[PDB]
Amino acid sequence: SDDKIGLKVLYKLMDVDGDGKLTKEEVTSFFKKHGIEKVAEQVMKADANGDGYITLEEFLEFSL
Ligand SMILES: [La+3]
């Protein structure tokens, strides 16, 4: 649960783009208000793939 209960909550609430995945553009867009900065860094290191997004599946996969 705590694995990403909240992170997911907010995230799921964040994903406004229109897909369900937590992408940078979409992130910085919505996070632009939050800590897009600190988030940008964390997100940048989060992706650790190339330039994708954080999907519920990937979000739970990373927690697992
Ligand atoms: La989205």
Map out the domains of the chain as residue ranges.
Answer: 1-64
Per the annotation, binding residues are 15, 17, 19, 21, 26, 47, 49, 51, 53, 58
Helix (H) or strand (E) holding 53, with range, is strand 53-55
The Å distance, Cα 62 to ligand 1 centre, comes to 18
CB atoms within 10 A of CB 14: 19
Helix (H, G, I), strand (E, B) or coil at 22: strand
Helix (H) or strand (E) holding 55, with range, is strand 53-55
Which residues are registered as beta bridge partners of 55? Answer: 21
Helix (H, G, I), strand (E, B) or coil at 52: coil
Give the list of residues 6+ apart from residue 20 with CB closer than 8 angstroms, or none: 55, 56
Q: What is the CATH number of domain 1-64?
A: 1.10.238.10
